[PDB]
Point group: none
Chain length 188, copies 6
Amino acid sequence: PIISENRHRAWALRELQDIKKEIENKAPGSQVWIQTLRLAILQADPTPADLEQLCQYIASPVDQTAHMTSLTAAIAAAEAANTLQGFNPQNGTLTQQSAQPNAGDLRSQYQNLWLQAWKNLWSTIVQGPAESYVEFVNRLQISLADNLKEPIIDSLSYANANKECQQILQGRGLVAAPVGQKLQACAH
Amino acid sequence: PIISEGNRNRHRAWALRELQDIKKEIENKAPGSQVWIQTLRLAILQADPTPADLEQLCQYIASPVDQTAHMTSLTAAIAAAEAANTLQGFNPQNGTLTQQSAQPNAGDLRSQYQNLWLQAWKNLPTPWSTIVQGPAESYVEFVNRLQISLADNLPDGVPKEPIIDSLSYANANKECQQILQGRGLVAAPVGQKLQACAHWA
Amino acid sequence: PIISRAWALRELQDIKKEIENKAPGSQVWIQTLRLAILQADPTPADLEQLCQYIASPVDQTAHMTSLTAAIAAAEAANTLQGFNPQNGTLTQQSAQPNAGDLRSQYQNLWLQAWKNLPTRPSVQPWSTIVQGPAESYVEFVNRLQISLADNLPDGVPKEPIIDSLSYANANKECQQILQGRGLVAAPVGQKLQACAHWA
Amino acid sequence: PIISNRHRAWALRELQDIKKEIENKAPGSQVWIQTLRLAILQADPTPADLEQLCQYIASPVDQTAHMTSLTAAIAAAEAANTLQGFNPQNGTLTQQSAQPNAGDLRSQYQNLWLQAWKNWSTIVQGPAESYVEFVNRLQISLADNLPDGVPKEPIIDSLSYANANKECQQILQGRGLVAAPVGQKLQACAHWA
Amino acid sequence: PIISEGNRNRHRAWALRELQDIKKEIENKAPGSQVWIQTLRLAILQADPTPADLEQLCQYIASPVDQTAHMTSLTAAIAAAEAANTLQGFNPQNGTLTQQSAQPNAGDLRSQYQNLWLQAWKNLPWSTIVQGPAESYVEFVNRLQISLADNLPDGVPKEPIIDSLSYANANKECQQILQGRGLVAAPVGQKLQACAHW
Amino acid sequence: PIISEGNRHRAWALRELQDIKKEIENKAPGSQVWIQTLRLAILQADPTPADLEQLCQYIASPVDQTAHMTSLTAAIAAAEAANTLQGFNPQNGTLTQQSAQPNAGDLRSQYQNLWLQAWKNLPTVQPWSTIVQGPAESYVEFVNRLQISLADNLPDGVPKEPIIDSLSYANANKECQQILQGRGLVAAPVGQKLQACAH
């Protein structure tokens, strides 16, 4: 944990115990799982070290190790692809760079991947004949928010809809409307 | 949450218990029910939260379905507010509304932001005036259904005061009606209608 | 809450939990409430907030009426100490922080308003409490005092009443003692210590 | 509660906390008394605050019984003028001690408040009861039942010998401890079979 | 408790929470046992309590009987301490030890007091420990140190005693081993290592 | 426990210890969880040798304390002899002594680690070079045992990475080796090695 005043302090156990219980009965990489962790991070603004500590309190060693793996995979890809905003390899690895209290700009990015590492072990996936439009949109925004939105969402919301609701969105010709207006229609 | 310090304010993250408390508080409330909505409004006063903090709440409190549904009506009303120009003091140049209210110093706009957010819960998919007092329903019980239903349902530009006072009589059974006739409280605010009819069997 | 601010939820959480199992307008109920306020020091605004967390909307409604009634009634009677109607209504005046003395009085009527409004029971006939052939004087007084603290007309001073019913509703046995020592008119507490021992 | 010339209101939790520990004790049980004796030290509470306590903690009967016995001893104390530093000119006992600055007097009020929760000896050591167990029951009953102004210690020192079973009375003769403070009596019979 | 706050030495009253916890922790302990005494030692170090605080403790944690036995042996140790003058720095003219040590600035004496207060739990109302033909070595060892930690007399160093009895009191099987390795005089920590096998 | 302000010692809070005990309550002495549980505590408090000695007693039975004190003082001797003690000057007292000072953080830090390790060495775990993939063991588990055995048994100053990277292939069975050969990852960071044999 880093305290902007930016000084690091180690974890309080109370902090950790709370999180475990919250997540206690959730599946690894499951959205609720991901949602639970996401909050804790925001509270603390933690270092990679702190994060590795996390793998250990919450995950089976297998799952930890598996995580260690998918993590570094995601790491190199960002590093290699220069998709890392502000990454200069000259100063050490990201894990080396992100350990810095002031490096909120970089640390933030590291934090994102760490979760993403949990999402591992959208245009393919489509709405079933009787799946509710709203939940269909739910799944859609799930997978998209992962990658990357609006024009895209507003597009796929129709494009990827089933025969029934398509006929409906056509009915008012909201085919090009923002997903928000499309939702209201198929609610019935 | 934004915290008062100097003439500058500082932002603070959630405490999990803070979040848990509200969840516990709201756990058994209906989405968009007044108790649901009022529960939150007070919470807002506590933190004076930025747009981010609020969304975080959706995840903690709402079924994923409800989470999406609210966001929908939300982004919609923003535009409507801009389009109708009901937004006091907004310059799109300084970012969208979502961006500006995140600032510790930008409380008035955040104040406005907080308001719309609440209202978006009445737009959820999850008849108020059809309710009448049964032959065996206590007036207080009758009045209960009535008041819940309005605060739940009645349109916004519409004053509850004149209506409540009116329907409290109109929609009563013969039994309770004759009494109000008896003292001529047909037109009194319902609270005085209440005072009278509380003992009936 | 006014300090030398908005609500704490936990504050709200505790009170519910603490009182939840208490009756509307009941004595234990009123007390559970009376306590929270001092801890917080709330405005007319904060109080309306309270109604909603704890009370059904009907009950919310009824209170507003008897309150405003007592307000006029208290003011008209000039029992209200120091009130100058000129600086705004009572509801208006009480919001400024340095005005602690006046804010204190607003709070009181709010409490009183919970008595005998739509809690009123079919179980109601208070003062019917009598000491059973085998009920202890000490609990008997308890039951009595409970019924009274729940049910009494307002213009009626409680003090003289308590000291009285303690003799009147007592059974055959205990009345004689009070005669025996001549304690029939004594404050009940004195009636208690003397009959505290009887079987 | 008074914290460092300024008064503080109660916290619900404080009150919630206290209720919970005392939950199963009887008024005037020593445990009852010790429980309360502690909070006063923690808070330094006013007459109002105490009166509030009656209400959170006691059935209404006991509340009144107390108010009676209290104000009575108050008078009895002032009448006996055992009341140190009180000027009736500056207000009543009940009124004056409410001042944060009036600590000496507030303290005396509090004791009485304790003493007021006031309103036996048949307990004996069985032929097969351990002396220590016997001794416990004794202090339990004694710490509970006392005439005011009547010292427990000399009373204690007495029954410790008197009410023991056959075996142990004999022991105190042997060492000559019949009148000795009980702490010195325990020392000997701690070993008995 | 005495709280250092901004260079003030200020006494603070107990928190019930503070009292409740200590009880909760100690609840299932035997009176005057090492674990009991150690448990208290921690509390004392956390709070730095006055004689007043300390008596109050007897009452929450101890039966009325055990409290009295304590007050007794305590006031006794006070005298012996004065008599042996193991008591460093006390001037009786400014009040009794009980009296002076209640003062916040008086840290040295209160320490000695607390110490005596602790020791007082020993004396209130042991080498027979042996290993059965079928008893695990470790448990035997455990049993031993327990007893020593509870019943050994003061001024007497435990270590040389421990190192000795760990061999002396073992059964044939394990004795043959300590002889076998010649660990007969070794610190017990070294004796432990070998008999883990039998 | 030491408090940092731009560094004063303070004693334990009982709650602190209880937290630790309750969390650690159901673990075997020296088990990784045990070890992990401890490693964090150190981080939270930065406790002195004295404090730690206090800690043994709260969590450990009297036998385990001695076994600990024994191997501890031993590892101390082994490390000093090896001069793996970074910054240690013997003239100013033992490691147990200097590191009790708030400013002697580097050395105490060195002290704290050993204290942990001694529970590993508890005379009351598989040697990593013995860890091999059985004829029928899943790759993922082999690696796991490996990393455990390593974190448990790796010598200091020795970087794990190349080691991890090396043995991960070497110690695989004939079956999985063909697979690793098949795609050619023998020199790859281990993370890339796991991905393949999942199949």
